[PDB]
Design a protein around this ligand. Structure first.
Ligand SMILES: Nc1ncnc2c1ncn2[C@@H]1O[C@H](COP(=O)(O)OP(=O)(O)OP(=O)(O)O)[C@@H](O)[C@H]1O
Ligand SMILES: Nc1ncnc2c1ncn2[C@@H]1O[C@H](COP(=O)(O)OP(=O)(O)OP(=O)(O)O)[C@@H](O)[C@H]1O
Lengths: 427, 427
């Protein structure tokens, strides 16, 4: 579990790195401009209440729905819900279109995302005693350990004395003993007393490196999916390795081996598992079979916070014989969650956002350029205008400038056109 | 091992029940008449020295040979060697003719006889604590056990507390705990909380009979062959059950399972194994392959005392291309042992023996009848005259008498004739 390192899809949250959380005071009322947020007071305060409902454990089989248009702070508020829940919490942003896979089933892909939303907080402090054995009999046992770069003799507690007698010991055996109720023995194992005659033996163990007394500090924050993806290999290259269509490395029997060891760490009290947040954009795209999986998922106490988002008003239920419902959510699951409405930003609110994103991205710009780009944030979507910051900075650097002006941003619209305008131009 | 009961061939030692051991004083000199012995002072004292050599552990790869005619106290002195070694020691009397089997090999039969000569002295005293669990948390643990006829609460030592935490416990579990460094748990097992719905479960254990606190006394004296013959069954009928020609119940893999558990009882210090005596009559009948097995056997420290007996002077070595040797023992094995000569008894010595056997067998006889039967002990063998005691007692009981006279013993010779006289009569 120490070797297991967390691999996170940072490209999804890359557009929200400018947001630090949810800007609100002690009473609960949202601030005008805090934590990288502009406006959206009604929706900010609303989910600022749901974070408390999770903390108070009052979200008994409940979820959240973010109703609003494109670029209305939906995905942004979802990340704020995680950021406000605790430190190093799992946030899994998905889109209904991601479920629509070619090889894996509609929920074999929804399963790993649920595993990507449930984490594990580890806080294990162990006192290592590695090396050989040099027995002495006092009034309750003295053993001298020999390591690769050190030698130390220690007067063991009578608790260890009972544990060592159970697992046969002799002078010249490599051992791993722990003060925190730990007993492990390697009978006769020692590379020092190994002859070159026998090779197939493997009955000997090398002399442990460093010192005998070692203070092992384990502070690990990994999701359940990280445990599955690390135990699948028969690991640095794996962050860029996926070129295989089948993806048969993750099998149901491999997950059972993870579920049992995770349970063992909870029973010991070493590490407790912490459920996070599962965000589903394009919630209407989800099949009826997916919603019934979610209904079963929400009933489990281990389950994370299922936050959905739908840009549609009235939509046909996917997986049903054409049944129009609100946001495309079936009634069975619509009642299961509380709806939070996300309001569109007026031109005055849009330029306040631009200045925050430019400051984070590292793009210097004139006051007049912010006004021109905000005009595109109201005529077209908020995502399109925000995308104009990076090409205009290159166009300015090329012209020798650091400050981006109207002339530089005018070319950005000419070169990089939105999906709506690009279609109409072709006629 | 408690269920394992010792089955011994009492018919072989039946003719020597009249002998209690070896009659000798503190200095070592043999008595005229003691322990059921008459004469044979030279041979009695000789093996009365070998018993001390075994006790002093000076019999380093050594044995004993009893050279003498038929009925010269050979088998009798061998039993005396066991009787003088210790209490409840194994004595295995064999004849060279027994090795000559139809199914098993010459040493597959010599092996079990060696297993019949190495015993195990057990002295285990255990403090049983059987019943359910009713946990209480004091300052190091209080558990109340519930048995079929009793209930008791006990304040356990902190040593048991560490052992119980290793093997998962809950309230209402049947447990077997020991004060003599013993820990055994049956997780969730209890017949009290068993529903009639599940049958294939077998996860529950019945409530232990009697009281919770039980003092188990185990004093067992069994040979290595007893452990093999009891573990062979998949046991009272077995004392008379042997009707199978193959005898495939005892396999090499079954013996390995006995060798490992016996070793475990020695390592714990519960029971130590004690080597006895292996007596081989008709030593000349043994094959050269048998003597090489004995040579390898005598070198082992676990080996019993190999006492041989040969009635032959110069005899050809069995298993060799006609090579005459002393007593039929090959030189390699002749040097390996010390020879004890057994002198034939004079008529005066024979009637002294008769009076001892008659007193043990329960046969009342006149002084004149002892003289007439002693005349047959000198003209014919000592075994033949000793055999005349039982039929003559029946002939006397039939005549209404309790005392056996000359007339009664005269008919016994007429009815039951020796092997020599029966042959010559036929002409
Ligand atoms: N209130 C806000 N304050 C600061 N930035 C905001 C605010 N609302 C939206 N944004 C930013 O707008 C940019 C693009 O919008 P985004 O893709 O996040 O839309 P969304 O409404 O959050 O989700 P959806 O994709 O479902 O519309 C992001 O960088 C987001 O953080
Ligand atoms: N010295 C003795 N004192 C009392 N009984 C004796 C004595 N010597 C022999 N006997 C008895 O003679 C009887 C028959 O002899 P047994 O078969 O024992 O012959 P053995 O010489 O001991 O052995 P083998 O069979 O090799 O001749 C037994 O009951 C035996 O105990």
């Amino acid at each position: 579990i120490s070797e297991v390192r967390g691999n996170t899809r940072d490209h999804r949250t890359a557009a929200h790195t400018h947001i630090k959380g949810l800007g609100l005071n002690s009473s609960g009322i949202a601030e005008k401009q805090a934590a990288g947020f502009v406006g959206q007071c009604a929706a900010r305060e609303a989910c600022g209440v749901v974070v408390d409902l999770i903390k108070a454990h009052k979200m008994a089989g409940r979820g959240v729905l973010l109703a609003g248009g494109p670029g209305t702070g939906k995905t942004a508020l979802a990340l704020a819900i995680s950021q406000e829940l605790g430190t190093k919490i799992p946030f899994c942003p998905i889109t209904g279109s991601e479920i629509y896979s070619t090889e894996v089933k509609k929920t074999e892909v929804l399963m790993e995302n649920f595993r990507r939303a449930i984490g594990l907080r580890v806080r294990e402090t162990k006192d290592v005693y590695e090396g050989e054995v040099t027995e002495m009999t006092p009034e309750t046992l003295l053993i001298g350990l020999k390591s690769a770069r050190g030698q130390k003799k220690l007067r063991l507690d009578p608790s260890i004395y009972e544990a060592i007698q159970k697992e046969r010991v002799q002078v010249g055996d490599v051992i791993y003993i722990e003060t925190n109720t730990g007993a492990c023995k390697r009978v006769g194992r020692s590379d020092a007393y190994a002859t070159e005659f026998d090779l197939e033996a493997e009955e000997y163990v090398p002399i442990p490196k460093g010192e005998v007394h070692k203070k092992k500090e384990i502070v690990q924050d990994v999701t359940l999916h990280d445990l599955d993806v690390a135990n699948a290999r028969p690991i640095i290259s794996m962050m860029g390795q996926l070129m295989k269509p089948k993806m048969t490395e993750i099998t149901d029997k491999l997950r059972m081996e993870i579920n049992k060891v995770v349970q063992k760490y909870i029973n010991q009290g070493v590490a407790e598992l912490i459920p996070g947040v599962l965000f589903i954009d394009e919630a209407h795209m989800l099949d009826i079979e997916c919603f019934t999986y979610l209904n079963k998922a929400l009933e489990s106490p281990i389950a994370p916070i299922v936050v959905l988002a739908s840009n549609r008003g009235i939509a046909t239920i996917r997986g049903a014989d054409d049944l129009k419902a609100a946001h495309g959510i079936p009634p069975d699951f619509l009642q299961r969650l509380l709806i939070i409405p996300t309001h569109p930003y007026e031109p005055d609110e849009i330029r306040r956002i631009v200045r925050i994103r430019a400051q984070t991205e590292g793009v210097q710009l004139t006051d007049a350029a912010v006004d021109r780009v905000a005009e595109h944030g109201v005529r077209i979507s908020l995502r399109y205008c925000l995308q104009l910051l990076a090409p205009a900075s290159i166009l300015a650097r090329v012209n020798g400038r650091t400050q981006v002006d109207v002339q530089d941003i005018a070319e950005a619209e000419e070169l990089f056109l939105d999906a709506r305008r690009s279609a109409n131009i072709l006629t």
